[PDB]
Design a protein around this ligand. Sequence first.
Ligand SMILES: [Mg+2]
Ligand SMILES: [Mg+2]
Lengths: 102, 102
Amino acid sequence: IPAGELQIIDKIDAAFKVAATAAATAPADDKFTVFEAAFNKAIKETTGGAYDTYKCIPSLEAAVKQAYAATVAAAPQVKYAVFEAALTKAITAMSEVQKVSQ
Amino acid sequence: IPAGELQIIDKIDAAFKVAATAAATAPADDKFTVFEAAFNKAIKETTGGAYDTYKCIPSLEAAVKQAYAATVAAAPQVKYAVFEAALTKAITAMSEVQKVSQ
Ligand SMILES: [Mg+2]
Ligand SMILES: [Mg+2]
């Protein structure tokens, strides 16, 4: 994890939970869109405007891409479920590293 | 797949989609309960009362147990997501066999 990103890992994890919660009650077809919108807003708010989107935090964008790649083979009905499970582990791994690094 | 269960595979798949849809909008903490309740009702209705619960259809109960076992190592936030992804593949496999068997 790039030293420059360490300071915001805790915020990423918090924002992620917020976004996951937001998409939890959204209809199946709206989960990805709601998740992203919620994730971006939580990140923007929690980082004080340092980032406007998760796509702009290097390590996170990398994890999101990998989480999406995990959905390619998954059936439509569960692509989001597969995505969330994958991303949850990735972010939790970042959080663990951040906690022992600082 | 036991010959006796073949006749209801299509109904299991349909009922599953109904239950997944039902739990899709339920709050995270209510997904498992809502899924099960919806699944049981859809099965009872679709099989004309032949079964009152998914736990009573041998092959399905087996798949549900395995799907749950897949959640043990998953974090709480995603246990249902992991469960649904696992069960979706299991049921789809049954459906594929049923379609070529009849
Ligand atoms: Mg929640
Ligand atoms: Mg649905």
